Amino acid sequence: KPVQNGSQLFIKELRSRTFPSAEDVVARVPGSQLTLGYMEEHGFTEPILVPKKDGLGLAVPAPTFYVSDVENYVGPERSVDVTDVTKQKDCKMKLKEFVDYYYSTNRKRVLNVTNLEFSDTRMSSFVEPPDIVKKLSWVENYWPDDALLAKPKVTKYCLICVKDSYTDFHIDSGGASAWYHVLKGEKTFYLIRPASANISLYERWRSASNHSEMFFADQVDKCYKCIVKQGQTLFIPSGWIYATLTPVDCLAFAGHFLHSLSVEMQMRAYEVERRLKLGSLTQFPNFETACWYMGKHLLEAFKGSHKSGKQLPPHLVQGAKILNGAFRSWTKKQALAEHEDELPEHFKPSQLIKDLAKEIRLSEN
């Protein structure tokens, strides 16, 4: 009998496996140093661990905040997605019910909540994402507060994982980057770099009928183990393929964002996830819409480069090329139908595309 991912035996095997340490890959950085300058210099191509929250501008409740507290501020009747780790299947249930299980003295099942976005609850005011995320985020910067399309609801997640919880290898939707803060307990990440072959292997693995029977890390050269302890915050870059294991009961907060340093990888991940057709519950809503607003921003910046005679940085110009390629593919008449639903009000795609194309020609010279 083949071992299924998430099963009791798998977890035992996994705990015994040795992995290269995240030491050579994950930078340890003090919160006050994680600046926009730092991101630009290093380019956010590898995860970053911030051992203490000081300097991050991160707002979170004290460690004396419990799952019972989440129930109160979120709402006991609130429906939630619950993952049965051993089956590797998802279901729905009231939060009060999950909480009743969580506090059970003899849990039979291994169940977690890893999709609870609480920006629309009373608990929202208790959590504020790190300053660096707000500075990098496309939605935070370029999506108007008066927009008719609702902003992607991906900014404040509460994760509750019991001991022995496992989340299998995945790339986050939209190739989005993540901040992940452990309030109580600890969370182990197994991190795989999005080198081109690795992404291709991931796509082939995720699309295979027997994928829940195969340990993905067996197929790549390096899978790095990174333990994130209480009070620590991990920043995961675009496109990284990762799984997690929960060694002790864990409560954590996280958010997802897109940014200008990984336009290429963001599109690549999006293309992969579109080919996979997972119809996820964790999909990045209105990813295309965020790209459209980025596109309008770039056109404005280019126009602004003509008033100063100061050219845009090369990564933006390249970002423009990649986005403009997307806009074209999304609006070819053979395509409109499904993609038009994400177009913001008052956008004229064929004009934007032509204006961006011209501006890029001029920038190149």
Nearer residue to ligand OGA within complex by CB, 176 or 291: 176
**Least distance CB 268 / Cl ion (angstroms):** 17
260 counts as binding ligand OGA under rule CB under 6 A: no
Q: Any binding-site annotation on 64?
A: no
Q: Any binding-site annotation on 244?
A: yes
CA 18 to chain centre: 26
Element (H, E) at 257: strand 250-257
Q: Any binding-site annotation on 170?
A: yes
Q: Any binding-site annotation on 282?
A: no
**What part of residues 194-233 is at the interface with ligand OGA (CB under 6 A)?**
none
Q: Any binding-site annotation on 180?
A: yes
Q: Any binding-site annotation on 172?
A: yes
Binding residue count for ligand OGA, defined by CB under 6 A: 12
**Least distance CB 251 / ligand OGA (angstroms):** 10
User: Which of ligand OGA, Fe ion, Cl ion, none has residue 244 at its interface (CB below 5 to 8 Å by kind)?
Assistant: ligand OGA
Q: Interface with ligand OGA by CB under 6 A: which range of 12-20, 159-167, 216-224, 292-300?
A: 159-167
Contact of 75 with 121, CB cutoff 8 Å: yes
- Residue 187 bridge partners (DSSP): 228
Provide the greatest CA pair distance for the chain. 69
**Least distance CB 139 / Cl ion (angstroms):** 4
83 counts as binding Cl ion under rule CB under 5 A: no
166 counts as binding Cl ion under rule CB under 5 A: no
Interface pick for Fe ion out of 46, 172, 273, 288 (rule CB under 5 A)? 172
φ, ψ at 224 (rounded to 5°): -90, 135
Nearer residue to ligand OGA within complex by CB, 203 or 311: 203
- List Cβ neighbours of 89 (8 Å cut-off, separation of 6 or more): 83
The H-assigned helical ranges of 196-262 are 196-207
Query: Whole-angstrom Cα distance, residue 27 to residue 237?
Result: 12
**Count of Cβ atoms closer than 10 Å to residue 119 Cβ:** 14
Query: Whole-angstrom Cα distance, residue 216 to residue 59?
Result: 35
293 residue type, one letter: Y
Interface pick for Cl ion out of 138, 216, 293, 302 (rule CB under 5 A)? 138
The site map against Cl ion for 258-297 (x = CB under 5 A) is x---------------------------------------
70 counts as binding ligand OGA under rule CB under 6 A: no
CA 83 to chain centre: 18
161 counts as binding ligand OGA under rule CB under 6 A: yes
CA 179 to chain centre: 8
Written as six digits, the tokens of 30 are 């003090």
Q: Any binding-site annotation on 92?
A: no
Contact of 103 with 114, CB cutoff 8 Å: no
**Least distance CB 236 / ligand OGA (angstroms):** 8
159 counts as binding ligand OGA under rule CB under 6 A: yes
Contact of 113 with 159, CB cutoff 8 Å: yes
CA 353 to chain centre: 28
178 counts as binding ligand OGA under rule CB under 6 A: yes
Q: Any binding-site annotation on 83?
A: no
Contact of 9 with 3, CB cutoff 8 Å: yes
Nearer residue to ligand OGA within complex by CB, 236 or 356: 236
Contacts with Cl ion, residue ranges (CB under 5 A): 137-139, 257-258
| Residue list, annotated binding site | 114, 167, 170, 172, 180, 187, 242, 244
